[PDB]
Design a binder for this molecule. Structure first.
Ligand SMILES: COc1ccc(C(=O)N2CCCC2=O)cc1
Ligand SMILES: N[C@@H](Cn1cc(F)c(=O)[nH]c1=O)C(=O)O
Ligand SMILES: N[C@@H](Cn1cc(F)c(=O)[nH]c1=O)C(=O)O
Lengths: 260, 260
């Protein structure tokens, strides 16, 4: 057996640097839902591991011209990492190049607004131009709008793709900051899981509105043909059935909520 | 290529006999969410199929003594069917003997009450004895309580396993009938999906209360090593991403709701 190289991404509250990470080493430098999940998965599958933060800080997309995969998906595809344990959305294009465990968490694209913003749905956003809106610059959310044939979402994509200044952001933190500093003139489309987390964070000035636009899940990913695939999948199912995944979500989302 | 034998189960609104099934033949005799799903899956995977109703009318469990698997899982395990397209819950014990596609529908165990029943949660049920409660006699819901280490659910299991007369029912329809005819003295624990469907059916006298006890999903199942596994999994992801699964749920659950 060899130490398993785990690729993941800095995204709250999945993986975050501990306040005093400078005084720590190895896996101890990080904390979060996926850090806890990695420990449980490794324990149940019987392997030693090393957490690493994805080099380019991306989730995973294929360049239409070079055909090269970036982000965590890329690290798995090219063998730079053995497994990805992060909020990586299970999608068809990814399932074609890597393997996914059954989902360990549910989510859907949602709307985040600065409290008081006169928006209640995606339809509302699409029917007005006063309030700008966008998504994470790369990832499954952006692709959802790019590919959607649903009238409302296609109308939103047409606006976002040519809006200026750009409505796309590099990170969730940037999207949240933009919502918080735009006096209600910017709304952010992001995964419900991140939205729900931020809503319970000071200064408690954001809120999730409307229902989710879709329904999907995050899965643990391995390179196709990996000897870890089967065990990891069974571990996810066992952890869900034992109520551990629900326990972990409450721990990182609500137990220490900062908004009452 | 050979005609694919699909095993499924009579469970509303997944698979139901058309009103005039007697005048129809083959797959045309049935209608429902899973009937529509089977057609879409077959279309995308390029295969011809024959719908069959599981012989013993069960979902799938292993006898602790004979080690024999019954229900739809059994039909796959022993090669009597090539694929199962029904509301079959993805569980660890099943994943060990058959393969599951990524989930095509989300669900969680929930509580169904006759309107007016003074119950709002599982905790409420566990802390009283006036109102009896049970689950489907066999399936993942019963197993959830049998295996749960969570205090409230373990307390509920202890009561249900020895309650008399028996609180377990043979079919969902029987559980619903019992709730409807027990004047509020019986509450039924069942999958949220079925609960949500029944709530919009006349005589509109039942309702879902409290949050779900767990979070999981239904998956399409194939015998381990099946040449259909990969294609079927990709088909499920494609159908979800195209919004077809959401369209199908609205079609069979809400579009024709009977309660306003
Ligand atoms: C936590 O349990 C689950 C998380 C995610 C999923 C899932 O992948 N999907 C896809 C379409 C609807 C749905 O729920 C199913 C169950
Ligand atoms: N999970 C996504 C990445 N990702 C993350 C977010 F927080 C969000 O709002 N949108 C998104 O696409 C993926 O796997 O690409
Ligand atoms: N989906 C389950 C079967 N099943 C169905 C129900 F409607 C219910 O309430 N409980 C249950 O276990 C399985 O796969 O065993």
């Amino acid at each position: 057996n060899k130490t398993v190289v785990v690729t993941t991404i800095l995204e709250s509250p999945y993986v975050m640097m501990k306040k005093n990470h400078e005084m720590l080493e190895g896996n101890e430098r990080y904390e979060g839902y996926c850090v806890d999940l990695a420990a449980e998965i490794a324990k149940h599958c019987g392997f030693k591991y090393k957490l690493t933060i994805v080099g380019d800080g991306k989730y995973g997309a294929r360049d239409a011209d070079t055909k090269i995969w970036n982000g965590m998906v890329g690290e798995l595809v090219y063998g730079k990492a053995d497994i990805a344990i992060a909020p990586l959305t299970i999608t068809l294009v990814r399932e074609e190049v890597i393997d996914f465990s059954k989902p360990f968490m549910s989510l859907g694209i949602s709307i985040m607004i600065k409290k008081g913003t006169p928006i209640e749905s995606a339809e509302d956003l699409s029917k007005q131009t006063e309030i700008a809106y966008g998504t994470l610059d790369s990832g499954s959310t952006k692709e959802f709008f790019r590919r959607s044939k649903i009238a409302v979402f296609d109308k939103m994509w047409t606006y976002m793709r040519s809006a200026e200044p750009s409505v796309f952001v590099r990170t969730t933190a940037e999207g949240v900051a933009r919502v918080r500093k735009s006096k209600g003139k910017y709304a952010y489309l992001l995964e419900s899981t991140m939205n729900e987390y931020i809503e319970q964070r000071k200064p408690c000035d954001t809120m999730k509105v409307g229902g989710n636009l879709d329904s999907k899940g995050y899965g643990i990913a391995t390179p196709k043909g990996s000897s870890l695939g089967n065990a990891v999948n069974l571990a996810v199912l066992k952890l869900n059935e034992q109520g551990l995944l629900d326990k972990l979500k409450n721990k990182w989302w609500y137990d220490k909520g900062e908004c009452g």
